[PDB]
Amino acid sequence: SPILGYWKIKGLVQPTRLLLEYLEEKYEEHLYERDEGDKWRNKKFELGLEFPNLPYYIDGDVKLTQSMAIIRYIADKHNMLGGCPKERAEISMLEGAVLDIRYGVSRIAYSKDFETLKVDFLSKLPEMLKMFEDRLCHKTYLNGDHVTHPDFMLYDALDVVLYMDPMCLDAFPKLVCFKKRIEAIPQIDKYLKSSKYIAWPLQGWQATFGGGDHP
Amino acid sequence: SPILGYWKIKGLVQPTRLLLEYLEEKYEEHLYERDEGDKWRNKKFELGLEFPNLPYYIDGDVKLTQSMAIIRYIADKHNMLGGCPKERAEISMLEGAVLDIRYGVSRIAYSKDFETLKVDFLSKLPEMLKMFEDRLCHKTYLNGDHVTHPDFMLYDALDVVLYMDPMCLDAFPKLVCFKKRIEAIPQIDKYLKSSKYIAWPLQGWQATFGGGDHP
Ligand SMILES: *SC[C@H](NC(=O)CC[C@H](N)C(=O)O)C(=O)NCC(=O)O
Ligand SMILES: *SC[C@H](NC(=O)CC[C@H](N)C(=O)O)C(=O)NCC(=O)O
Ligand SMILES: *SC[C@H](NC(=O)CC[C@H](N)C(=O)O)C(=O)NCC(=O)O
Ligand SMILES: *SC[C@H](NC(=O)CC[C@H](N)C(=O)O)C(=O)NCC(=O)O
Ligand SMILES: *SC[C@H](NC(=O)CC[C@H](N)C(=O)O)C(=O)NCC(=O)O
Ligand SMILES: *SC[C@H](NC(=O)CC[C@H](N)C(=O)O)C(=O)NCC(=O)O
Ligand SMILES: N[C@@H](CCC(=O)N[C@@H](CS)C(=O)NCC(=O)O)C(=O)O
Ligand SMILES: N[C@@H](CCC(=O)N[C@@H](CS)C(=O)NCC(=O)O)C(=O)O
């Protein structure tokens, strides 16, 4: 059974969890708690990883790090990355545009100056969201009728920015619908209600925004 | 003929240029100068881009943004991304590990506190480089005998960190060799000597590190 290792937080790996659950894939997790740095450090170089880091994904011979390599691998095994170079590039474009939002948050979330930095981020956020709002015209998911991994990435990004500004989707009804559509996927509905769902923190526990043991 | 648009800097797009040149692909560039923000802003929404941004790559019907989508697209058209999910994931892992170095620089390069932040980055850099040093044991390129896009990404990262600390590869002879190997690829040798090579800046011109009109 594959092993997905990360801090017991949403962070970089939450879209991967959602994708695995969507696919009904069997996996176990190594979940490092806030005080378990020592535990991670004692395993870091003992797992066969060529590029030791968190998250990791171990699947027989396959030992992977890099969150994006991992999510894309799971997707790839299910024939989800795209049917030709142009569609693969389209999906990678969606992926990167989501990361501009999600990393946009993480870039500032650990700063002493988060509250001032938040102003600048929220000023740019509507422009980024509008691109997705436009993309969703006449589409159920970002690539139309079928789910792709960026859908779970975008889902996670929306979850996160809504904590930062609960009104940030008020101008984007299609994105509001989209978030509900993901939540309506029966596998996702079940997961979000399950003992396996990690609601919080959004970032590493030490973050100024999206950190701490509880919201 | 495809169009690659970016600021006239190395920045996010330099590995893409190197890959195109390696492949002997025909392309033209839209190169925005330091004072040409207005020019970019007047084109940004007039190019058919679904996710307007820099860089962009326009190839007939195909209008792409996201630097990583673009480099991977060029690679994909040349059957370079990997022969199966595991190899594709391996290549995406290399890609992400390079980005930890290259984005590691960009994260701090625009800060007023760059000089203090540099200490922390240079403290972590040897650990990141060692993973690549180990990977290159008995290999010509990162994936062995054949070039892949992360080779050009790593090349660009080494170029950049050597400006920050010219001694940072003193402990990593295989990486030193690697950088020279890339420079010895005849297409790359020619490109680096050509009028098309943009030597500087490394970052946006306004950066504290790797900015300005000249080094
Ligand atoms: S991957 C094969 C090509 N399809 C697409 O590019 C799909 C585009 C959208 N992502 C979608 O509609 O889902 C292909 O061969 N298309 C036929 C063509 O017009 O050439
Ligand atoms: S999908 C966005 C546009 N449609 C609408 O606004 C119709 C009203 C719907 N209730 C809604 O989606 O808001 C649209 O079709 N834009 C593209 C076009 O060709 O006009
Ligand atoms: S949210 C689902 C989409 N409807 C609208 O955008 C209308 C929004 C209302 N005007 C509002 O709440 O303000 C939609 O068109 N969905 C169709 C689809 O194929 O996704
Ligand atoms: S993509 C097909 C598989 N090959 C690899 O994974 C290549 C691994 C390295 N990147 C390399 O050697 O270049 C494959 O089918 N391998 C055969 C097997 O052992 O199953
Ligand atoms: S590739 C690194 C190891 N080889 C050497 O150190 C031999 C000397 C060479 N001049 C050099 O590469 O430095 C090596 O083989 N490590 C793996 C192993 O199986 O020992
Ligand atoms: S740099 C090329 C590799 N040689 C070494 O690592 C030895 C380095 C010296 N000890 C030194 O300069 O300090 C190498 O083994 N290359 C073979 C390959 O297949 O790449
Ligand atoms: N580019 C990497 C970044 C990984 C990373 O920064 N991981 C942090 C957690 S968010 C960590 O704790 N890494 C463990 C380590 O470096 O030992 C990825 O996307 O996986
Ligand atoms: N995730 C994007 C980031 C792109 C980006 O930040 N581009 C900057 C230059 S480094 C820019 O000037 N963008 C133009 C714009 O936003 O209008 C990518 O990798 O392409």
UniProtKB/Swiss-Prot annotation, chains A, B:
Pfam families membership: GST_C_3, GST_N
Binding site for glutathione: Y6, W7, W40, R41, N42, K43, K44, N53, L54, Q66, S67
Catalytic activity annotation: RX + glutathione = an S-substituted glutathione + a halide anion + H(+)
Gene3D superfamilies: 1.20.1050.130
GST C-terminal domain span: 84-202
Example of a GO MF term: glutathione transferase activity
Catalytic class of the enzyme: transferase
Keyword Protein biosynthesis belongs to the record: no
Keywords annotated in UniProt: Transferase
Residue ranges occupied by any GST N-terminal domain in the UniProt entry: 1-82
Keyword Transferase appears in the UniProt entry: yes
One BP annotation, GO: glutathione metabolic process
Residues at which substrate binds: Y110
EC number(s) per entry: 2.5.1.18
Quaternary context: Homodimer.
Family: Belongs to the GST superfamily. Mu family.
The protein's role, per its UniProt record: Conjugation of reduced glutathione to a wide number of exogenous and endogenous hydrophobic electrophiles.
Note, other: There are at least two isoenzymes of GST in S.japonicum.
Cited PANTHER family: GLUTATHIONE S-TRANSFERASE, GLUTATHIONE TRANSFERASE
Protein name from the UniProt record: Glutathione S-transferase class-mu 26 kDa isozyme
